[PDB]
């Protein structure tokens, strides 16, 4: 199994607890289909050099493993799940894939595609092709366009389709179709894998209100933090609060929604503010005047708690969550120039993955931010990911914790 | 000197003769000032990771040097010229630099910058800062904006400010101000360095008709080929023909103007068609229905040769130049998908530098084009330059031949 023996189920009650299991995805053939004319549509700042990108991702994975972390590759998890899934589950995955296809498939092409998918010899090949996209060449047919089924180039950012929330999970209604299609696999593994089937869902794609994993944070057993960004709307958080209040076993007591600049290239709260240690936060000063907060009471707020604006400054807001004096580390460090803050913020300089309290992994490129993290007492385990970074996401974006060890608060 | 013992002056009568001396420029501090909001303005497709960019450039230079080529760094050529220039030329360099500043300098800032420049102890320091740009921090002054004088980030694309033409040169009036400023150094070295001072100019920046080096090709002793592109206009070529005729020592007899797609990211003829061997050419099929041609008779066309339309298809046009059937190699090779052609054409897949007939240097990333070149009998010496490529130019763009050995046609 992709899961080691200790993995029981989803268990993520912090952003910093010693990481046990994490989900990743090395960019497959899907990124080979990104073209100049479709960059904006496919959500990339520039075309990645595929070979280097895959090499960079392997170093990322290696670093994770060197820290005794159980790394799970999306493709293998999906294929493992497919292998032990009921025939109906197997056929439904193929039908839903066809129905949610982009572009929308004429009936003739649907038949050809279904037959092509079903003719795949192995479980992994099936999954690979569904993620990669399908060309007229692959099908052996004539067509007025090369991509019969578009790629899912953003799959390597496993942070976004679904988020582990305590022992539950939120499978999202993503903002753009190009990524919405990714939640097909999320629904598949949680609805069918032995180790995940019991996982409760606090949100699902049918809900139609936009929300993505990069905006979801698990600060502690009591408080969740969700961004109001280019990808997640406040009304969606309100629905989430409702769904959580409706789940009895869920023990979270509060949600703090945090407003951030609605930039298409820094699209989630995690590209503006992250929690990297018990009392340490990394943020980009560029959002100084935009940050705005709302509290949701999941205890005494009724079955449908509403957002109550919290007028505290960022430091006071954070202190109200952890009950300790918070340390705020600015992108590029004290004394950085605006050019440096803009450039390092641009390359997701706030987006580090904490693998243990105060120990993080992130791109080596943001050197001034790396220096600032070290100076603040945080250990940085850099890895080279210049190509990967062109997809506009750093290490947090390319990971989805499945289980973290308890934090000694 | 930066020039080796044998360099005698400009000697470029082809695109493929054994390269003897070539001008390059390793990206200095100027690229650290590229910010996300200024990408389109500064002419970059994305922000380069500066450190890797410089390492990539050193590899490019190492490859050139491994092939017995005298590689000249622009900073050193300018500093060397400065050291031997008259006090009048030295002072004027600084005044013209201030006069042509972007943004335009206030009188107060003008005095501050001038003093700062004159206070630099070494000529290399002076050239470095003029290229890099100047911040309020560098000057130790208070200001509303950080950049008092903008960087000239594109300087590493030495192919464009001026072109060696036979034993003469064309110093250009470039399309955009951000690059026009680079010609300051071009005029300076050709007006003061003893080994360049006798070079005749067939064009200078004061003419105000747009033209750039990437559009200039020296096919052979009789024929010059100039692109009609996003950066060079047909009327400019007409003025060039006029200037060449006026020069009695010049021996070129014909100019073939070639119309190319006017794409902002594939801005010169050399991003669409290049000559890499005595009869081998690399082109992108994407320009197939756009290529159009004109002929200028430099011998019997009068004092002001006019462009005469040439109706031959590309193969016939090229044959009329080399008097031999050309071999046309398409980007990504035979059978490539349109996605492959679009991607490799995008990364300047046509932009290779010939260091001798049938032997070229260019980025390793365009693997299908590299394979097609080798399959066509051309030896490729690749190097990794993924960061450099984000500036939208390849090896030919990053070099300006100063002298080549005669070709044994
Ligand atoms: C991080 N979690 O903010 N996500 C980055 C996702 C980048 C991707 N290209 C997209 O969704 O735009
Ligand atoms: C090569 N000669 O085609 N020139 C590329 C120059 C790229 C640069 N960023 C600019 O001038 O746009």
From Swiss-Prot, chains A, B:
GO molecular function, one term: arginine deiminase activity
Annotated localization: Cytoplasm
The protein's Enzyme Commission number: 3.5.3.6
Record keyword Metal-binding present: no
Catalysed transformations (reactions): L-arginine + H2O = L-citrulline + NH4(+)
Biological processes annotated in GO: arginine catabolic process to ornithine; arginine deiminase pathway
Matching SUPFAM superfamilies: Pentein
Gene Ontology CC terms, in alphabetical order: cytoplasm
Keyword Hydrolase: yes
Pathway(s) the chain acts in: Amino-acid degradation; L-arginine degradation via ADI pathway; carbamoyl phosphate from L-arginine: step 1/2
Active site: 397 (amidino-cysteine intermediate)
Cited Pfam families: ADI
InterPro entries to which the protein is assigned, alphabetical: Arg_deiminase (IPR003876)
Record's keyword terms, sorted: Arginine metabolism, Cytoplasm, Hydrolase
Main localization (coarse): cytoplasm
NCBIfam families: arcA (TIGR01078)
PANTHER family xref list: ARGININE DEIMINASE
Record text on subunit structure and interactions: Homodimer.
Family per similarity comment: Belongs to the arginine deiminase family.
Protein name, per record: Arginine deiminase
Top-level taxonomy: Bacteria, Bacillati, Mycoplasmatota, Mycoplasmoidales, Metamycoplasmataceae
